[PDB]
Design a protein around this nucleic acid. Structure first.
Ligand SMILES: [Mg+2]
Ligand SMILES: [Mg+2]
Ligand SMILES: [Mg+2]
Ligand SMILES: [Mg+2]
Ligand SMILES: [Mg+2]
Ligand SMILES: [Mg+2]
Ligand SMILES: [Mg+2]
Ligand SMILES: [Mg+2]
Ligand SMILES: [Mg+2]
Ligand SMILES: [Mg+2]
Ligand SMILES: [Mg+2]
Ligand SMILES: [Mg+2]
Ligand SMILES: [Mg+2]
Ligand SMILES: [Mg+2]
Ligand SMILES: [Mg+2]
Ligand SMILES: [Mg+2]
Ligand SMILES: [Mg+2]
Ligand SMILES: [Mg+2]
Ligand SMILES: [Mg+2]
Ligand SMILES: [Mg+2]
Ligand SMILES: [Mg+2]
Ligand SMILES: [Mg+2]
Ligand SMILES: [Mg+2]
Ligand SMILES: [Mg+2]
Ligand SMILES: [Mg+2]
Ligand SMILES: [Mg+2]
Ligand SMILES: [Mg+2]
Ligand SMILES: [Mg+2]
Ligand SMILES: [Mg+2]
Ligand SMILES: [Mg+2]
Ligand SMILES: [Mg+2]
Ligand SMILES: [Mg+2]
Ligand SMILES: [Mg+2]
Ligand SMILES: [Mg+2]
Ligand SMILES: [Mg+2]
Ligand SMILES: [Mg+2]
Ligand SMILES: [Mg+2]
Ligand SMILES: [Mg+2]
Ligand SMILES: [Mg+2]
Ligand SMILES: [Mg+2]
Ligand SMILES: [Mg+2]
Ligand SMILES: [Mg+2]
Ligand SMILES: [Mg+2]
Ligand SMILES: [Mg+2]
Ligand SMILES: [Mg+2]
Ligand SMILES: [Mg+2]
Ligand SMILES: [Mg+2]
Ligand SMILES: [Mg+2]
Ligand SMILES: [Mg+2]
Ligand SMILES: [Mg+2]
Ligand SMILES: [Mg+2]
Ligand SMILES: [Mg+2]
Ligand SMILES: [Mg+2]
Ligand SMILES: [Mg+2]
Ligand SMILES: [Mg+2]
Ligand SMILES: [Mg+2]
Ligand SMILES: [Mg+2]
Ligand SMILES: [Mg+2]
Ligand SMILES: [Mg+2]
Ligand SMILES: [Mg+2]
Ligand SMILES: [Mg+2]
Ligand SMILES: [Mg+2]
Lengths: 118, 8, 56, 123, 114, 209
RNA sequence: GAUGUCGGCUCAUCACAUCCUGGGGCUGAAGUAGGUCCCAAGGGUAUGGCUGUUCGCCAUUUAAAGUGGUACGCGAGCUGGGUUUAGAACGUCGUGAGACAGUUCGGUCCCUAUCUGCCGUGGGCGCUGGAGAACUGAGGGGGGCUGCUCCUAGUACGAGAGGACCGGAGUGGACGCAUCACUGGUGUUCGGGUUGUCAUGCCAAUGGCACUGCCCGGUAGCUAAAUGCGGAAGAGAUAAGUGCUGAAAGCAUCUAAGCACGAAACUUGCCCCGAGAUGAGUUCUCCCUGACCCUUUAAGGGUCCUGAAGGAACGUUGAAGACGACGACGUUGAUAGGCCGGGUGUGUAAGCGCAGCGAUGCGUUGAGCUAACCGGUACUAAUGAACCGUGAGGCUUAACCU
RNA sequence: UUCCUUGUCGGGUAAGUUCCGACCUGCACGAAUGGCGUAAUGAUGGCCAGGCUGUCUCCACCCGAGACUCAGUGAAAUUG
RNA sequence: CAGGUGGUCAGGUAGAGAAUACCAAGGCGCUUGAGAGAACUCGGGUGAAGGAACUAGGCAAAAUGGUGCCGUAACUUCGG
RNA sequence: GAGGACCGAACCGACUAAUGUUGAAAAAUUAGCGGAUGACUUGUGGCUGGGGGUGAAAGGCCAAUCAAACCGGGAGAUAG
């Protein structure tokens, strides 16, 4: 049974899942649009959008909490200098998922995920 | 096959 | 465990009577290109619901 | 929550120190004895000049359990160990003359009023 | 569930005092021995608190006659008449379940003092 | 006697004055609008058909909307029937509310139980497991034997096996009615009733004594 | 040209020659309690010590611990203790190689299910225009156990001891269904401590790895040890049995005519499934009302125009789920994510500052962080469309209306 | 090594066909194809106890790899 | 092709260590993937009360585990 | 500073359990296990030949073959 549970296992263990979403959130902050599978893009909103909410108040403790969750000073710098001031009057919904075709090697349903003002 | 293991 | 008799070509086609594929009925037309695409998917030329979403 | 092979402490001065539950009485396939239930025991440890000897087969009533009791409001009373009071096999009267430790209000019946009177504390 | 919280907010006690884990608390509960009705005390250390509104509870540990006794009290139950703090303790945890394996002088708790 | 259609709001507790806590399930019973009366001349049996709740007007089909508009009541979320006794009569358009149970002492509650999916025989039928150790080869929760040798040479019908568990109609009988609150459309029964929070419940008076 | 085998485990099913529970007759049946026979198969019918044991003896319970069939039920369901090829020893027999329902220590248990069957879950077509719902109920299945305490009453009966029938009330054991409000388990998706090492330039602060590194608490969900409910009463027809009236047989006789009682067995009453019940039922509601051509002439075919009610597909998804299916929703929107407030949990973050030689302590500060929870909010995604499904629905008789 | 045999008696257990001690009726022990003892040793046979625990009462939840579905490639035993 | 094959070289922190954990130089993610989050199998984690009642048998699991110091019985072939 | 001494890696073995058993493998993997200065272990070459070898003895081993190896002949042995 599965009732009322959250989170996708994605055929990984938990430390692989956490390392994978730290890399994917850093790539989405860097390039502002990536292509991945659709279930990974749906599980990435619950990772990336709290970092943008964290970057709407600038403090030393919020930089350190973003560095603890991203481990990249370039990503924390872009979160707190650029993405924070962009989304300062937007209550959530910082990303947008666009479904695209199927991956050629395994028929995987692919999707784009971007930031809203790109 | 080692048939002699069968208990007769 | 294995069969005791050879199954016929009739029973094989009866088992394969649920194997047929479904063709997509729903090809939409994009409202600025007029090109077909899947429903709720972007087009091949990078449009979606009237706008150029990827400039590639 | 006492079943067979459970070791219990002894809460009177009858002479016994450790007893083992060897039957939960009062029904077929009956599993557990809580606080207030009669069990059949055997004596594993005794003091050198007590009322009972080692290897005796007696009856006993459970007075304290680690599982505890439940109250009609939903409250629970637990204890740190399991204790019982030895009874005669036929009269089912207490063997000792003092009771040690607190007991609960589930022993309050016509069968066990000498325990209620001898107890230092009733919870 | 505004329905269930409306039904539960009208049953909650309004004069429940402040206590925390580690405190020594005397609880007075209603007992009925036959058909007359009395109050009895339970005094010990608060080792656990559960906070759920009407379903709040707290666990009190005491040493009675050389025996360990634990009591879970339902907080808003009308059997519990009063809660009173006799001493404030200084602990670092929310659950003092490690006090079960300690006895005597190993089980002392510092007073907070600040 | 007829009953009412309600909704499971959830469980809570009621404290009484002597310090007894009663576990209760809270059932919201809004007014049931009678939509059709059936009788022996046209239908062969006597019954009423009620509705409750509300529906989006874009989600009500035209046959359903014409069935509700012929009676003159607003469209609810469904339709349920109750067999009438001899000497009980209602009219179409009548509202029945939770004060029908003001003097009823015990009720039967029918709901759709929770879905467990595909269940094994240990969970579904309380089968005993085999040995966890002592040589057991891949047979720890398997069902064991399912029949006898050459006589009869088959498995009997109704053999307890694994399959769909839950997600079915269940009735709990003779539940004490604790409180009927007509001002807030509530009925409180003692104990637990089938289904998840938010599911539809049918509350009838008790058929037994 | 192979039908695996004692005992156990798991799962059973049937018989009745009945162990308990129900109903009766006789008793050398005072009452309690027994004996023996007749009827009755609905439900139930121990845990341990010894032993491979089935049995058996024993300990302690129970209302009771039934006797058999089913390849002495069940190894393509499990074990492998008994038996048990090849090793070895003892007793014994034989000159010997070797032998022994004599013994003893050791000694490889394969199979991805085609068909029948059983458990669940779907697709097709039928049900005679199509569609959406609520039902009736032929038939089927589940369930059916019982102790103890108290009142009748210390009454009946009995010398005394002892101690009832009928009937009523309560509270338990085993078993079944449901549920998560309470007590608890889990809680590698929340918080915190901590050993070693590596990294982030460094201090401080964090992150990776070492079983989640080891641990301590714990949200929701799931759950039992948790806590609600249950078995019925009642009715019909009966078993054994007991009778009323009553002759054949002037009497008698329960029976042949007629009439009445009578049990957990039977049929119903309780729960669920159920119209493929091809005998395909009922009730309510809703949609569709254009013109041609030909053939061999009939439930004909083709053409252009038309496209409803409803559905399916697609998307957001679920307390629903292996996949199908089922349920909620798609801007006339709270359906999921995010965001906002609350809760809950953990337990006083970082920075700075003050005391201290220092590890640390204290103030800011019940702080900071907080998954699945609760109440809100269109910020992100749920598209204008397209697609399937038609155009009043056969013949014969009967009754009413024209 | 003993068939009868679970011989009889004691111990250990609430209860012991195994174990330990003893008796002697040795079916059918016995002195270098050695008799009887024996500290130390043994992945050796048997039996008892303390610790410890999902072995069990009676199972519950979690984490991973399969089983399930989508795409690609693609066996086998058997078979009138 | 989770098997087999002799020699030589031997960094840092901790450590008695060529054990073990984490790293350097150096080298690798092991030639199908993508989802979902049923029974049941495999490999693991945790568990109320009880504690060998399981079983042929404590099989498997749990448990103990290092350094220094205090202390250690019967028995003995005087070493243990 | 002795030892067919002790604990324990490499190295040599193979006691238990699970797994696999159309295996990853015609004897293995995982976790525990014994020996580990010696009657040790191993590289390179050499010798012993089929009624023969060699054997700390299991009828064991002599190229996945052993109560008489393999290959070719007698040979189309013979088969109530
Ligand atoms: Mg969800
Ligand atoms: Mg996979
Ligand atoms: Mg055949
Ligand atoms: Mg197929
Ligand atoms: Mg479900
Ligand atoms: Mg297994
Ligand atoms: Mg054959
Ligand atoms: Mg009979
Ligand atoms: Mg009789
Ligand atoms: Mg034994
Ligand atoms: Mg058999
Ligand atoms: Mg078989
Ligand atoms: Mg054997
Ligand atoms: Mg074995
Ligand atoms: Mg044997
Ligand atoms: Mg097998
Ligand atoms: Mg095997
Ligand atoms: Mg067949
Ligand atoms: Mg029936
Ligand atoms: Mg809750
Ligand atoms: Mg808890
Ligand atoms: Mg945890
Ligand atoms: Mg670190
Ligand atoms: Mg530092
Ligand atoms: Mg690293
Ligand atoms: Mg890790
Ligand atoms: Mg590493
Ligand atoms: Mg129905
Ligand atoms: Mg029909
Ligand atoms: Mg609104
Ligand atoms: Mg004896
Ligand atoms: Mg002897
Ligand atoms: Mg001899
Ligand atoms: Mg001689
Ligand atoms: Mg001699
Ligand atoms: Mg000698
Ligand atoms: Mg020995
Ligand atoms: Mg024993
Ligand atoms: Mg598959
Ligand atoms: Mg495929
Ligand atoms: Mg290889
Ligand atoms: Mg080597
Ligand atoms: Mg290493
Ligand atoms: Mg690979
Ligand atoms: Mg899983
Ligand atoms: Mg574990
Ligand atoms: Mg446990
Ligand atoms: Mg425990
Ligand atoms: Mg045993
Ligand atoms: Mg047993
Ligand atoms: Mg072991
Ligand atoms: Mg040595
Ligand atoms: Mg060694
Ligand atoms: Mg091995
Ligand atoms: Mg190994
Ligand atoms: Mg080793
Ligand atoms: Mg030989
Ligand atoms: Mg030889
Ligand atoms: Mg060879
Ligand atoms: Mg020869
Ligand atoms: Mg020939
Ligand atoms: Mg010849």
């Amino acid at each position: 049974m599965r009732h009322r549970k959250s989170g996708r296992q994605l055929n990984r263990n938990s430390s692989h899942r956490q390392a994978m979403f730290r890399n994917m959130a850093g790539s989405l902050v860097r390039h502002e649009i990536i292509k991945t599978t659709l279930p990974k893009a749906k599980e990435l909103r619950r990772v990336v959008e709290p970092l943008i909410t964290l970057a709407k108040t600038d403090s030393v403790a919020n930089r350190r909490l973003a560095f603890a969750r991203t481990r990249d000073n370039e990503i924390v710098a872009k979160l707190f200098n650029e993405l924070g001031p962009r989304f300062a009057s937007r209550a959530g919904g910082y990303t947008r998922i666009l479904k695209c075709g199927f991956r050629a090697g395994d028929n995987a349903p692919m999707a784009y995920i971007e930031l809203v003002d790109r | 096959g080692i048939f002699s293991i069968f208990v007769i | 465990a294995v069969q005791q008799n050879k199954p016929t070509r009739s029973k094989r086609g009866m088992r394969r009577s649920h194997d047929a594929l479904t063709a997509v009925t729903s090809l939409s037309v994009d409202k600025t290109s007029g090109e077909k695409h899947l429903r709720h998917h972007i087009t091949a030329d990078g449009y979606y619901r009237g706008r150029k979403v990827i400039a590639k | 929550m006492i079943q067979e092979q459970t070791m219990l402490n002894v809460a009177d001065n009858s002479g016994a120190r450790r007893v083992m539950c060897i039957k939960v009485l009062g029904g077929s396939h009956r599993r557990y004895a809580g606080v207030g239930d009669i069990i059949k025991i055997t004596i594993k440890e005794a003091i050198p000049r007590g009322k009972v000897k080692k290897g005796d087969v007696l009856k006993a009533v459970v007075v304290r359990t680690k599982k505890g009791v439940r109250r009609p409001d939903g409250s629970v009373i637990r204890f740190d160990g399991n204790a019982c009071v030895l009874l005669n096999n036929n009269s089912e009267q207490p063997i000792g003359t003092r009771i040690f430790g607190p007991v609960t209000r589930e022993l309050r019946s016509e069968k066990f009023m000498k325990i209620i009177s001898l107890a230092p504390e009733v919870l | 569930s505004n329905i269930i919280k409306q039904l539960e907010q009208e049953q909650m006690k309004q004069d429940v005092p402040s206590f925390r884990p580690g405190d020594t608390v005397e609880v007075k509960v209603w007992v009925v021995e036959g058909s007359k009705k009395r109050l009895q005390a339970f005094e010990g250390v608060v080792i656990a608190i559960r906070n759920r509104g009407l379903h709040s509870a707290f666990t009190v540990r005491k040493i009675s006659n050389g025996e360990g006794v634990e009591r879970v009290f339902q907080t808003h139950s009308p059997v519990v008449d009063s809660i009173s703090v006799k001493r404030r303790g200084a602990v670092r945890k929310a659950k003092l379940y490690y006090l079960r394996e300690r006895t005597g002088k190993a089980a002392r708790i510092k007073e907070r003092l600040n | 006697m007829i009953g009412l259609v309600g909704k499971k709001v959830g469980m809570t507790r009621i404290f009484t004055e002597d310090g007894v806590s009663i576990p209760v399930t809270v059932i919201e019973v809004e007014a049931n609008r009678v939509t059709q009366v059936k009788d022996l001349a046209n239908d062969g049996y006597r019954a009423i058909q009620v509705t409750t709740g509300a529906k989006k007007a874009n989600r009500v089909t035209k046959p359903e909307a014409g069935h509700f508009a012929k009676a003159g009541v607003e469209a609810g979320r469904g339709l349920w029937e109750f067999r009438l006794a001899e000497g009980e009569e209602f009219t179409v358009g009548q509202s029945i509310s939770v004060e029908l149970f003001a003097d009823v002492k015990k009720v039967d509650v029918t709901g759709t139980s929770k879905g467990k999916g595909f269940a094994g025989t240990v969970k579904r039928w309380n089968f005993r497991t085999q040995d966890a150790t002592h040589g057991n080869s891949l047979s720890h929760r398997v069902p064991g034997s399912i029949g006898q040798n050459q006589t009869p040479g088959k498995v009997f019908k109704g053999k307890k096996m694994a399959g769909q568990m839950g997600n079915e109609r269940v009735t709990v009988q003779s539940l004490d009615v604790v409180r009927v609150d007509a001002e807030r459309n509530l009925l409180l029964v003692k104990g637990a009733v089938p289904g998840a929070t938010g599911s539809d419940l049918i509350v009838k008076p008790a058929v037994k004594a």
